[PDB]
Structures are given as C-alpha cells and as structure tokens.
Amino acid sequence: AIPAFHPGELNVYSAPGDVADVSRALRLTGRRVMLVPTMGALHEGHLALVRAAKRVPGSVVVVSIFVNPMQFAYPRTPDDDLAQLRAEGVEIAFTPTTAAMYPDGLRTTVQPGPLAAELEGGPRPTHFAGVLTVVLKLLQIVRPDRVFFGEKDYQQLVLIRQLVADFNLDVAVVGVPTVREADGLAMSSRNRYLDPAQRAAAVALSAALTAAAHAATAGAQAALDAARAVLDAAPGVAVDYLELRDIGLGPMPLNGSGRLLVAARLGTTRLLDNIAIEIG
Amino acid sequence: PAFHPGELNVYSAPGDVADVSRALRLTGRRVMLVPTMGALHEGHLALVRAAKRVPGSVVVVSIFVNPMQFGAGGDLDAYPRTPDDDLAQLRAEGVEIAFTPTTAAMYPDGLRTTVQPGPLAAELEGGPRPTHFAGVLTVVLKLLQIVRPDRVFFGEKDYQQLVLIRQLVADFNLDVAVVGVPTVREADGLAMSSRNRYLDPAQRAAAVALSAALTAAAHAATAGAQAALDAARAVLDAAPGVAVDYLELRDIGLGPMPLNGSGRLLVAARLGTTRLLDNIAIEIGT
Ligand SMILES: Nc1ncnc2c1ncn2[C@@H]1O[C@H](CSCC[C@@H](O)CO)[C@@H](O)[C@H]1O
Ligand SMILES: Nc1ncnc2c1ncn2[C@@H]1O[C@H](CSCC[C@@H](O)CO)[C@@H](O)[C@H]1O
C-alpha cells in the first residue's frame, strides 16, 4: 500500500522505500519525476536547480537532502531548507538517515574512472567514489527522468555523465549554470566564512575566468595568461590549479570548445569556479 | 525494433533490447532476466524454466562472454562459444528474447566507471583472481540497467557470485528481485558446468568426489562441523588426481559472521588443468 502523497504540498519522506513507492506511483499517473540531489543548507544556487526541474511539463520535483559521509560538521538547517522548498512549490523532499542509506556500511561501491584522481581528486582522492556511489543509489531509489547538477562543480557533473553512460542508466543528466553574487562570485555556503579582505579577493576567481573567456579570441595561451594575471593581482589567494581542458575534461583541443577550471584557498576556505571557453 | 511474440527475438544493440523491454513492461508483461556467457547446458535451462514459470513473464536471456571478469592471458579465448546450439536451446525453451551484445557496445569506453565489490570479492574464488568479481558485478549492473527486469536469475553453483549479486542489489538499491536456482547435477552428482567438457573419462570419473564429499559432509553434519569437514576431506583424499584448492564452511552470507547451525560448504578443486566448483547447504546438528 503506497504511502500518503498530498499534491501541491511539501511531502517529506525519510525512508528510501517510501519515496521509491511514491515516485513509482506518481510516474504511473503521468508525472515526470525530476531529481535534485543536495546536501541541505540551500541557497539560491540550489533553487536554480529546483526551478530548472519545475519547468519541465508534468514535473514532480524530488529534492534529496542527505549529507553523504562517503564524500567527506557541515551546515545543517533542516526546518529552513524545507521552508525554502515549500516556498518553491516542491512536492517531495527525501531526507534519509545515514543508517537508511548505508544499512550494511560501505560494501559495494562505484569506482570512478581516472578523471576522479585529477583536479579536485588531487587533494581528495576518494571524494568522487563517494559522490558517484550516493548518486547511483539516489537514482535507483527515485528513478527520475532527469537529474540536476550545478555547473559550479563541473568535474562532479562530468563524472556523473560518465557514471550514467558507463552503467547504461536511463536518466538525462541536466547541468544548470552557476548562480553568482552581484560581483560574479559563485554562490556557495562557504562564502560566509570569508573575512572582508578574503571576500574582496574572492572576486578574482570569476573575474579571472570571464577575462579568459574574452581573451580566448587571441587563443588558448592568451586566455590562460589573462586568467593568471587577474589571480596574480589578488592577495591571499593560493591557486591550487588553473586548467583548460575540453568539455569532457580531456586534454584541450587545438581549437573548439573547452572549459577553464580554477580552485584556490583563501585562508582555510577552498573555492572553485569554471567557465566555458571557445578557442579562437 | 520489432518483437514477434511466441518466437525468439535476437537483439544485439543495447538500445534495441532496452526499447523492447520497456515497451513490454508498459503492456503488462513482467521481464525476467537470465544472464549467461552462452555455452548453455541444463543448468542454464533450469534458470530459464524458473524465469518462464513466473506468471505473465517475458524471458530475456543475455549471452555475453564478458571480457572484464577474465584475467590474462588466456582464459577468455579458451571459454567455449557454441552460439548455434545456444539459440536453438532457447528456441526449444520458448524464450522470447536473446540479448547478444558486442564487446564494443558494452565497453565503448573501455574500463572507465566500474563496480567495486565488498571484501568478499577478495576471498575464495577472488583470492587468485582479485579483479574477477569487479568484472562480474560491473557487467551485471549494466545488464540490469539495459534490461530493467523485475527479477534476475542466478545458479547456486556459483554461490559466491550469487551472494555478491545480492550485495550489489542491496547496496545500490537496485529495484530487482534476485532469484537463486538450485544446482543441476549429472546422474552421479557432478554439478553441471561448461568446464566439465574438459574432463577426460578418467578425470570425469574422479570428479564425482566433489559432490560425494559435500553430500557426505551434509549428512555427517548432525555430528557437528569437525565431522562434516573431515568426512568431505576423506572423500577428497581418496580421489585419484583431485587437487583441492579450498574446502570451506561458511555462514550462508559468506561474510564477516561465524557459522552457527546454517551454512554453506564450498569446494574448489583441480582435475588436471580443469578447475571445478561445487557447494552445498549445511545444517549443523540437524
Ligand atoms: N552557485 C551554484 N549554482 C548552481 N548550482 C550550485 C551552486 N552551488 C551549488 N550548486 C549545486 O548544488 C548541488 C550541491 S549538493 C550535491 C550532492 C552530490 O554531491 C551527491 O551527494 C550541486 O549540484 C552543486 O553543483
Ligand atoms: N549446474 C548448474 N545449475 C544451475 N545453475 C548453473 C549451473 N551451472 C551454471 N549455472 C549458472 O549459469 C550462470 C553462468 S553465467 C554467469 C554470468 C556472470 O558471470 C556475468 O556475465 C550462473 O548463474 C551459474 O551459476
């Protein structure tokens, strides 16, 4: 017997089987199930995922809130997150416990391809296994038609595309453009940790990337050099990498579409950003 | 793509069987999946029959000699391929779908994202072959995603493989029921296997010691674990030219738990270059 679902209201489920049964029943009624995976502490960046999901005709939006210990006190405002979702007209929140997600501990897991050891995988060599493992599980629990990820974490988005292709998953992966503060800083929960000198310096990540994207008419080296100049003008910004790659994060082609990605530490706060680049 | 019912329909393209499967499921039919590497014998046909008896089912039998679950050199080229016989057997069984993918269609990016099994995969069959079960669970995952069956069928013969498939399915919340089917045996007890064709008359005669030892142990087990294990071992010791790789008594889930009353006794032995497996349910004190 299928759990209670009240249309037009926020329905919250903590049991994987409960959201699974409702998702299945809803799909049979001709809803298209959209999945928005989050780790809570929702800002406008996450709302852009929600709104992207909402605009699909027939959508019912499932937002998972689950702090996945496998990809690591993280920020935790449960009541506030649910209010944001309620305000957005999301009808399903999925809020499992760790015990619910991992009843048998870490046993079978996803091993990502080699890209998981590069870029963000340098400092954190197991982070992406954690991500792909919990993503695969949510996909199987919820069985969405489409799943939504922000372009801000571009490498995560690329690896999710690889997970979906590699395991023949029947879901469309949708990347949603980065939401930015008024000065271009990519929205992130971490931003609140920056002191005022750090927050002023943080602007150099996005400024560096936009410079590069416009410098790119003069070629790949001019793009990279323009980006480095901007980063070089910021104090207290320790660049971990600044790398131009093709859109699938392979080596950058001589001409064509690429992505430029940057990561930097401002004190104890690590920030990432990335931008589309067209070479020449 | 076309699907003619009451006939065997062979699809090579994953997209083709995916479309047909989905179409069938929407029309009411329940999809049964029986994954094989071909070279079918009566053991595989019990799997088919178990699938076939599920009411309203359509049966998909996949045939794919999965390069990822083989080590080098060596073994992959040596696995028997008898596809004419296979398809004929499936037709004779009233199976409606054979799925026969190419390596390129399954591994267009080579080994990129893969399944990493739990620690069980390092044990028993995994000992000499530490990448073996990653290969199996990777292809089984992909098959379940392509075919999206209601239930998937595996033999008890490869009992550790069954256990790990159950782990895959639990751990990744796969929406499929795993059905284990009892081992089909020759008249004397020899567990049916594609490997048996590599036993000459003498080795074939000796090979009965595997099932003899396990059934003796299952009967001796009223007298406890030591008695069960020592009975099996005596039968194996008395068998000409059987080299035992392992004989282990484990809990039914094979994992980080002690044996109590209920267990599984598993044997692997070499007859010349041919490596044979068998296992049996054990009840201690029963
Ligand atoms: N500023 C932003 N703009 C757009 N998307 C964003 C932003 N900030 C965060 N997100 C997006 O919000 C999601 C964060 S939680 C991801 C869960 C996954 O790891 C599995 O556990 C992710 O899709 C970010 O890329
Ligand atoms: N004698 C038997 N009785 C019952 N089932 C059997 C027997 N012999 C083999 N099988 C069963 O036939 C299947 C072999 S193909 C497994 C495919 C996997 O590695 C990924 O490609 C397996 O379910 C055996 O346990």
XYZ file of C-alpha atoms and ligand atoms in Angstrom:
616
model
C 0.000 0.000 0.000
C 1.534 3.230 -1.356
C 2.337 5.979 1.261
C 0.341 9.203 1.511
C 1.072 11.815 -1.164
C -0.656 15.232 -0.937
C -0.383 17.153 -4.263
C 0.668 20.813 -4.106
C 2.250 20.430 -0.681
C 5.710 19.538 0.566
C 5.662 15.786 1.303
C 8.692 14.704 3.313
C 9.958 11.111 3.320
C 12.874 9.664 5.249
C 12.528 6.015 4.145
C 14.076 5.072 0.818
C 11.300 2.585 0.067
C 8.641 5.258 0.831
C 9.987 7.796 -1.692
C 10.588 4.892 -4.086
C 6.931 3.776 -3.885
C 5.575 7.294 -4.259
C 7.953 8.074 -7.166
C 6.794 4.884 -8.967
C 3.072 5.566 -8.323
C 3.487 9.160 -9.420
C 5.223 8.197 -12.652
C 2.319 5.838 -13.496
C -0.077 8.786 -13.188
C 1.895 10.552 -15.954
C 4.178 12.744 -13.830
C 7.789 13.137 -14.941
C 9.983 12.710 -11.845
C 12.850 15.203 -11.526
C 15.641 14.614 -9.045
C 17.636 17.412 -7.404
C 20.316 15.966 -5.111
C 21.531 18.252 -2.345
C 23.309 18.187 0.933
C 20.993 20.769 2.536
C 21.874 24.297 3.632
C 20.128 25.546 0.461
C 20.983 28.817 -1.229
C 19.765 30.415 -4.456
C 22.202 28.174 -6.387
C 20.218 25.146 -5.306
C 16.924 26.986 -6.057
C 18.093 27.362 -9.649
C 18.308 23.538 -9.769
C 14.775 23.355 -8.343
C 13.386 25.894 -10.797
C 15.059 24.105 -13.742
C 13.381 20.890 -12.579
C 9.956 22.594 -12.078
C 9.727 23.976 -15.612
C 9.525 20.526 -17.221
C 5.844 19.935 -18.177
C 4.299 17.334 -15.863
C 7.165 17.568 -13.354
C 7.085 16.439 -9.825
C 10.226 17.637 -8.034
C 12.132 15.377 -5.640
C 14.914 17.193 -3.689
C 17.120 14.851 -1.703
C 18.715 16.297 1.395
C 21.458 13.956 2.552
C 24.838 14.733 3.963
C 26.796 11.912 2.378
C 29.594 10.860 4.785
C 31.176 8.867 1.947
C 32.242 12.106 0.112
C 33.729 13.649 3.296
C 30.048 19.426 10.980
C 28.676 20.523 7.583
C 25.918 23.252 7.742
C 22.564 21.701 8.835
C 19.326 23.768 8.890
C 16.553 21.182 8.289
C 13.471 23.344 9.058
C 14.837 26.236 6.988
C 15.674 24.049 3.978
C 12.112 22.648 3.960
C 10.603 26.125 4.106
C 12.675 27.165 1.056
C 11.439 24.109 -0.841
C 7.849 24.687 0.305
C 8.205 28.274 -0.931
C 9.416 26.945 -4.322
C 6.441 24.573 -4.697
C 8.499 21.361 -4.472
C 6.196 18.427 -3.638
C 8.737 15.823 -2.434
C 11.710 16.073 -0.058
C 13.723 12.914 0.586
C 15.615 13.125 3.920
C 17.154 9.680 4.660
C 19.445 8.999 7.627
C 22.914 7.630 7.107
C 21.781 4.259 8.507
C 18.999 4.199 5.920
C 21.343 4.866 3.009
C 24.124 2.621 4.285
C 22.339 -0.225 6.208
C 25.294 -2.528 5.610
C 28.123 0.048 5.893
C 30.383 0.734 2.934
C 30.326 -2.542 0.985
C 29.756 -2.427 -2.819
C 30.853 0.969 -4.201
C 31.339 2.782 -7.503
C 34.944 3.080 -8.694
C 35.144 6.168 -10.952
C 37.382 6.340 -13.994
C 40.818 8.130 -13.885
C 39.343 11.624 -14.079
C 38.335 11.181 -10.443
C 42.035 11.355 -9.472
C 42.654 14.663 -11.234
C 41.788 18.276 -10.309
C 39.501 18.020 -7.227
C 40.740 14.405 -6.766
C 44.347 15.559 -6.083
C 43.588 16.780 -2.506
C 40.703 14.288 -2.116
C 41.407 11.001 -3.898
C 38.191 9.236 -2.671
C 35.746 12.147 -2.873
C 34.292 11.197 -6.254
C 33.739 7.494 -5.424
C 31.663 8.863 -2.516
C 29.734 11.131 -4.850
C 29.110 8.571 -7.589
C 28.124 5.890 -5.064
C 25.454 8.051 -3.378
C 24.269 9.390 -6.768
C 23.807 5.887 -8.234
C 21.782 4.960 -5.092
C 19.521 8.025 -5.300
C 18.984 7.338 -8.981
C 17.921 3.764 -8.226
C 15.733 4.822 -5.263
C 13.919 7.666 -7.018
C 14.198 6.561 -10.691
C 13.885 10.146 -12.050
C 13.518 11.032 -15.700
C 16.016 13.823 -15.238
C 18.600 14.609 -12.582
C 20.001 18.163 -11.968
C 23.524 19.287 -11.018
C 25.132 22.725 -10.948
C 27.901 23.567 -13.416
C 29.846 25.104 -10.482
C 31.062 21.633 -9.626
C 31.924 20.887 -13.194
C 34.124 17.828 -12.591
C 31.370 16.270 -10.488
C 28.934 16.921 -13.386
C 31.321 15.324 -15.937
C 31.830 12.221 -13.757
C 28.058 11.872 -13.288
C 27.714 11.892 -17.109
C 30.379 9.183 -17.197
C 28.527 7.171 -14.479
C 25.267 7.416 -16.484
C 26.886 6.394 -19.836
C 29.073 3.713 -18.336
C 26.305 1.922 -16.409
C 23.646 2.377 -19.145
C 21.437 4.424 -16.748
C 18.099 5.574 -18.099
C 18.185 9.222 -16.848
C 19.002 12.553 -18.548
C 21.732 14.475 -16.696
C 20.988 18.276 -16.733
C 23.778 20.742 -15.863
C 22.477 24.068 -14.540
C 24.539 27.332 -14.956
C 26.307 28.685 -11.866
C 24.395 31.234 -9.830
C 26.648 34.162 -8.818
C 26.600 37.023 -6.412
C 26.315 40.531 -7.786
C 30.072 40.751 -8.322
C 30.374 37.359 -10.033
C 31.414 35.235 -7.017
C 29.940 31.761 -7.474
C 27.338 31.176 -4.746
C 28.476 28.670 -2.154
C 27.710 28.042 1.537
C 31.449 28.536 2.173
C 31.340 32.189 1.139
C 30.085 33.259 4.577
C 33.398 32.103 6.070
C 35.420 34.691 4.153
C 36.509 37.714 6.134
C 36.114 41.036 4.316
C 39.658 41.045 2.782
C 39.100 37.458 1.641
C 35.633 38.200 0.239
C 37.036 41.185 -1.694
C 39.906 38.997 -3.015
C 37.491 36.123 -3.865
C 36.147 38.092 -6.829
C 39.429 37.304 -8.696
C 38.224 33.718 -9.441
C 35.246 34.720 -11.521
C 36.960 37.851 -12.865
C 39.883 35.654 -13.983
C 37.570 33.239 -15.798
C 35.493 35.892 -17.608
C 38.692 37.691 -18.654
C 39.944 34.401 -20.081
C 36.720 33.653 -21.875
C 37.071 37.000 -23.686
C 40.820 36.817 -24.146
C 40.244 33.456 -25.906
C 39.762 35.084 -29.365
C 43.545 35.536 -29.166
C 43.951 31.736 -28.460
C 44.489 29.312 -25.556
C 47.698 30.766 -24.193
C 46.266 34.338 -24.133
C 43.199 33.017 -22.276
C 45.293 31.245 -19.669
C 47.687 34.169 -19.318
C 44.834 36.659 -18.907
C 43.336 34.447 -16.120
C 46.663 34.112 -14.292
C 47.233 37.905 -14.432
C 43.918 38.520 -12.653
C 44.653 35.866 -9.971
C 48.155 37.390 -9.625
C 46.539 40.728 -8.742
C 44.733 39.237 -5.679
C 46.303 38.954 -2.268
C 45.883 35.881 -0.068
C 44.572 33.717 -2.935
C 46.505 30.466 -3.135
C 45.847 28.918 -6.528
C 45.632 25.096 -6.363
C 45.074 24.785 -10.141
C 44.028 26.747 -13.193
C 43.463 24.376 -16.106
C 41.983 24.480 -19.574
C 40.506 21.169 -20.724
C 37.959 20.060 -23.340
C 34.348 19.954 -22.264
C 34.621 16.287 -21.088
C 37.753 17.284 -19.147
C 40.100 15.564 -21.589
C 43.116 17.460 -22.996
C 42.163 20.791 -24.603
C 41.836 20.546 -28.440
C 43.797 22.981 -30.650
C 40.579 24.891 -31.372
C 36.957 24.499 -30.312
C 35.056 24.355 -27.046
C 36.810 23.957 -23.738
C 36.327 24.508 -20.036
C 38.655 26.607 -17.849
C 38.610 25.495 -14.167
C 40.211 27.127 -11.112
C 40.495 26.215 -7.422
C 42.057 28.363 -4.751
C 42.372 28.621 -0.983
C 41.617 31.821 0.850
C 42.837 31.093 4.347
C 41.051 27.864 5.330
C 38.269 28.319 2.713
C 38.652 26.492 -0.637
C 36.783 27.951 -3.583
C 36.134 26.609 -7.097
C 34.879 28.122 -10.324
C 34.908 27.249 -14.041
C 33.736 28.756 -17.319
C 33.052 27.717 -20.906
C 35.822 28.733 -23.292
C 35.758 28.810 -27.159
C 39.294 28.778 -28.531
C 39.810 31.427 -31.211
C 12.517 -2.558 -33.375
C 10.124 -5.500 -33.947
C 9.083 -8.035 -31.289
C 7.242 -11.161 -32.519
C 5.729 -12.985 -29.539
C 5.802 -16.769 -29.228
C 9.144 -16.512 -31.061
C 12.812 -15.974 -30.162
C 13.799 -12.394 -30.978
C 17.568 -11.729 -31.054
C 18.813 -8.199 -30.346
C 22.415 -7.162 -30.350
C 22.058 -3.393 -29.732
C 21.575 -2.476 -26.019
C 19.245 0.331 -27.128
C 17.138 -2.238 -29.019
C 16.556 -4.600 -26.083
C 16.061 -1.613 -23.767
C 13.265 -0.230 -26.008
C 11.576 -3.605 -26.413
C 11.849 -4.398 -22.678
C 10.345 -1.050 -21.691
C 7.613 -1.474 -24.321
C 6.817 -4.937 -22.958
C 6.737 -3.810 -19.348
C 4.302 -0.991 -20.171
C 1.922 -3.524 -21.784
C 1.765 -5.561 -18.558
C 4.396 -8.287 -19.084
C 6.948 -8.895 -16.309
C 10.537 -9.028 -17.516
C 12.736 -11.919 -16.388
C 16.499 -11.684 -16.979
C 18.805 -14.721 -17.135
C 22.437 -13.560 -17.608
C 24.752 -16.133 -19.209
C 28.011 -16.408 -21.009
C 26.485 -18.881 -23.508
C 27.660 -22.488 -23.917
C 24.327 -23.415 -22.448
C 23.613 -26.684 -20.638
C 20.675 -27.963 -18.483
C 21.865 -25.892 -15.520
C 21.216 -22.725 -17.561
C 17.906 -24.193 -18.755
C 16.682 -24.568 -15.112
C 17.288 -20.811 -14.773
C 15.253 -20.284 -17.943
C 12.436 -22.522 -16.702
C 12.329 -20.771 -13.301
C 12.053 -17.474 -15.155
C 9.461 -18.937 -17.532
C 7.056 -20.074 -14.843
C 6.683 -16.544 -13.355
C 3.127 -15.588 -14.477
C 2.873 -13.149 -17.392
C 6.634 -13.044 -17.785
C 8.712 -12.403 -20.858
C 12.155 -14.028 -20.588
C 15.348 -12.286 -21.680
C 18.437 -14.461 -21.788
C 21.646 -12.477 -22.288
C 24.624 -14.173 -23.836
C 27.864 -12.225 -23.407
C 31.335 -13.540 -22.687
C 32.335 -10.682 -20.530
C 35.996 -9.860 -21.042
C 36.121 -7.900 -17.719
C 35.628 -10.969 -15.437
C 38.585 -12.821 -17.010
C 42.250 -12.362 -16.116
C 45.007 -12.586 -18.738
C 46.086 -14.472 -20.796
C 44.409 -16.724 -21.734
C 41.074 -17.881 -20.236
C 38.927 -15.507 -22.332
C 39.931 -17.067 -25.694
C 39.524 -20.558 -24.121
C 35.877 -20.062 -22.941
C 33.531 -22.210 -25.107
C 31.424 -20.472 -27.677
C 28.597 -22.590 -29.147
C 26.031 -19.910 -30.196
C 24.183 -22.075 -32.750
C 23.437 -24.641 -30.022
C 22.658 -21.778 -27.538
C 19.989 -20.108 -29.682
C 18.465 -23.499 -30.585
C 18.213 -24.426 -26.909
C 16.472 -21.082 -26.226
C 14.045 -21.582 -29.109
C 13.302 -25.115 -27.757
C 12.574 -23.480 -24.389
C 10.092 -20.899 -25.756
C 12.260 -17.954 -24.620
C 11.197 -14.802 -26.437
C 14.350 -12.695 -26.154
C 18.065 -13.412 -26.571
C 20.310 -10.358 -25.932
C 23.702 -10.825 -27.651
C 25.738 -7.623 -27.219
C 29.132 -6.887 -28.797
C 32.152 -6.000 -26.637
C 32.282 -2.588 -28.310
C 28.620 -1.924 -27.428
C 29.211 -2.877 -23.740
C 32.679 -1.310 -23.297
C 32.774 1.593 -25.785
C 34.994 3.487 -23.318
C 36.934 0.518 -22.059
C 37.157 0.269 -18.272
C 36.140 3.616 -17.018
C 33.477 3.682 -14.292
C 33.273 0.280 -12.643
C 31.748 -1.549 -9.668
C 33.956 -2.154 -6.701
C 32.704 -5.209 -4.762
C 32.943 -5.567 -0.952
C 35.777 -7.599 0.730
C 34.031 -10.902 -0.074
C 35.248 -10.463 -3.620
C 38.877 -10.857 -2.366
C 38.100 -14.248 -0.801
C 37.658 -17.806 -2.136
C 37.360 -17.507 -5.936
C 38.669 -13.927 -5.570
C 41.944 -14.994 -3.931
C 43.894 -15.906 -7.118
C 41.666 -13.617 -9.193
C 41.327 -10.336 -7.340
C 39.649 -8.457 -10.265
C 37.246 -11.253 -11.102
C 34.092 -10.161 -9.274
C 34.511 -6.473 -10.123
C 34.148 -7.709 -13.700
C 31.003 -9.743 -12.950
C 29.186 -7.103 -10.877
C 30.075 -4.402 -13.477
C 28.507 -6.362 -16.367
C 25.561 -7.494 -14.234
C 24.837 -3.916 -13.194
C 24.955 -2.774 -16.850
C 22.620 -5.696 -17.872
C 20.112 -4.835 -15.159
C 20.135 -1.181 -16.363
C 19.733 -2.103 -20.004
C 17.066 -4.773 -19.472
C 15.445 -3.366 -16.250
C 13.986 -6.765 -15.283
C 11.562 -7.465 -12.392
C 13.625 -10.478 -11.362
C 17.109 -11.753 -12.321
C 18.151 -15.441 -12.133
C 21.429 -16.972 -10.974
C 22.530 -20.532 -10.132
C 23.630 -21.646 -6.665
C 26.520 -23.391 -8.415
C 28.470 -20.132 -8.382
C 27.325 -19.397 -4.898
C 29.795 -16.624 -4.046
C 28.777 -14.930 -7.250
C 25.117 -15.140 -6.167
C 25.979 -13.702 -2.761
C 27.863 -10.767 -4.310
C 24.994 -10.119 -6.710
C 22.639 -9.909 -3.753
C 25.129 -7.435 -2.213
C 25.198 -5.348 -5.427
C 21.451 -5.265 -5.490
C 21.046 -4.267 -1.774
C 23.902 -1.776 -1.732
C 22.897 0.131 -4.866
C 19.129 -0.116 -4.066
C 18.514 -1.847 -7.392
C 14.802 -2.460 -7.944
C 15.061 -6.144 -8.900
C 14.498 -9.447 -7.073
C 17.482 -11.833 -7.108
C 16.384 -15.467 -7.574
C 18.884 -18.203 -6.782
C 18.174 -21.500 -8.605
C 19.383 -24.903 -7.274
C 22.384 -26.550 -8.975
C 21.542 -29.065 -11.716
C 23.607 -32.237 -11.417
C 24.515 -35.175 -13.639
C 23.118 -38.620 -12.610
C 26.092 -39.281 -10.347
C 26.012 -35.860 -8.660
C 28.586 -33.937 -10.766
C 27.490 -30.307 -10.879
C 26.810 -29.296 -14.468
C 29.309 -26.777 -15.841
C 30.729 -25.766 -19.218
C 34.110 -26.784 -17.679
C 33.060 -30.460 -17.480
C 33.694 -30.882 -21.236
C 37.469 -30.539 -20.401
C 37.406 -33.651 -18.196
C 38.581 -36.789 -19.948
C 36.921 -40.156 -18.968
C 39.293 -40.692 -16.001
C 39.031 -37.105 -14.668
C 35.293 -37.297 -15.232
C 35.159 -40.457 -13.125
C 37.252 -38.784 -10.343
C 35.126 -35.600 -10.448
C 32.186 -37.253 -8.665
C 34.336 -36.844 -5.492
C 33.364 -33.191 -5.225
C 29.617 -33.786 -4.895
C 30.179 -37.058 -2.947
C 32.315 -35.185 -0.364
C 29.781 -32.364 0.038
C 26.770 -34.703 0.376
C 28.671 -36.879 2.857
C 29.522 -33.696 4.850
C 25.835 -32.584 4.751
C 24.888 -35.953 6.326
C 27.780 -36.139 8.786
C 26.897 -32.649 9.978
C 24.430 -33.986 12.604
C 27.653 -34.799 14.396
C 28.982 -31.203 14.105
C 31.355 -29.092 11.978
C 34.531 -31.104 12.508
C 32.755 -34.277 11.470
C 31.225 -32.674 8.337
C 34.544 -31.189 7.204
C 36.540 -34.373 7.958
C 34.001 -36.509 6.062
C 34.317 -34.264 2.984
C 38.087 -34.269 3.252
C 38.325 -38.071 3.433
C 36.295 -38.458 0.240
C 38.511 -35.848 -1.491
C 41.752 -37.530 -0.182
C 40.531 -40.897 -1.537
C 40.005 -39.410 -5.053
C 42.713 -40.046 -7.636
C 44.174 -36.835 -9.054
C 41.910 -34.291 -7.421
C 43.887 -31.327 -6.096
C 41.825 -29.305 -3.628
C 42.340 -25.548 -3.742
C 39.874 -24.884 -0.898
C 37.181 -26.509 1.193
C 35.411 -24.025 3.412
C 32.447 -23.998 5.667
C 30.908 -20.548 5.987
C 27.765 -18.778 7.067
C 25.110 -18.598 4.322
C 26.069 -14.965 3.501
C 29.817 -15.880 3.368
C 30.623 -12.550 5.125
C 32.013 -11.209 8.492
C 29.907 -13.661 10.540
C 30.526 -17.006 12.287
C 28.856 -20.211 11.219
C 26.098 -21.226 13.696
C 23.730 -24.020 12.597
C 23.159 -22.902 8.956
C 25.941 -22.716 6.478
C 27.262 -23.375 3.067
C 30.157 -25.730 2.390
C 32.173 -24.779 -0.712
C 34.863 -26.664 -2.541
C 37.178 -25.793 -5.420
C 39.443 -28.455 -6.910
C 41.648 -29.025 -9.963
C 41.380 -32.057 -12.204
C 44.476 -31.625 -14.372
C 44.143 -28.043 -15.646
C 40.318 -28.026 -15.203
C 39.140 -26.141 -12.125
C 35.807 -27.289 -10.662
C 33.473 -25.719 -8.066
C 30.649 -27.086 -6.046
C 28.828 -26.118 -2.879
C 26.076 -27.366 -0.644
C 23.745 -26.311 2.152
C 24.950 -27.472 5.560
C 22.839 -27.612 8.774
C 24.890 -28.311 11.874
C 23.107 -30.617 14.424
C 20.067 -31.140 12.085
N 26.145 28.541 -7.087
C 25.589 27.447 -7.589
N 24.987 27.471 -8.792
C 24.448 26.355 -9.318
N 24.489 25.198 -8.649
C 25.059 25.129 -7.433
C 25.635 26.259 -6.853
N 26.149 25.923 -5.652
C 25.905 24.613 -5.505
N 25.228 24.140 -6.578
C 24.783 22.788 -6.822
O 24.032 22.260 -5.647
C 24.399 20.852 -5.532
C 25.148 20.692 -4.171
S 24.847 19.094 -3.324
C 25.438 17.799 -4.490
C 25.149 16.372 -3.981
C 26.136 15.375 -4.613
O 27.486 15.703 -4.226
C 25.803 13.975 -4.114
O 25.889 13.930 -2.665
C 25.365 20.525 -6.742
O 24.643 20.191 -7.975
C 26.041 21.872 -6.896
O 26.785 21.916 -8.133
N 24.810 -26.719 -12.829
C 24.178 -25.548 -12.728
N 22.963 -25.452 -12.127
C 22.318 -24.284 -12.008
N 22.866 -23.169 -12.491
C 24.082 -23.198 -13.112
C 24.774 -24.401 -13.245
N 25.915 -24.155 -13.888
C 25.958 -22.846 -14.151
N 24.847 -22.265 -13.684
C 24.509 -20.863 -13.747
O 24.617 -20.313 -15.078
C 25.156 -18.939 -14.937
C 26.561 -18.847 -15.592
S 26.798 -17.280 -16.484
C 27.034 -16.045 -15.128
C 27.156 -14.611 -15.700
C 28.036 -13.673 -14.849
O 29.359 -14.261 -14.513
C 28.169 -12.307 -15.580
O 28.272 -12.442 -17.019
C 25.313 -18.672 -13.435
O 24.061 -18.206 -12.933
C 25.604 -20.104 -12.970
O 25.526 -20.286 -11.542
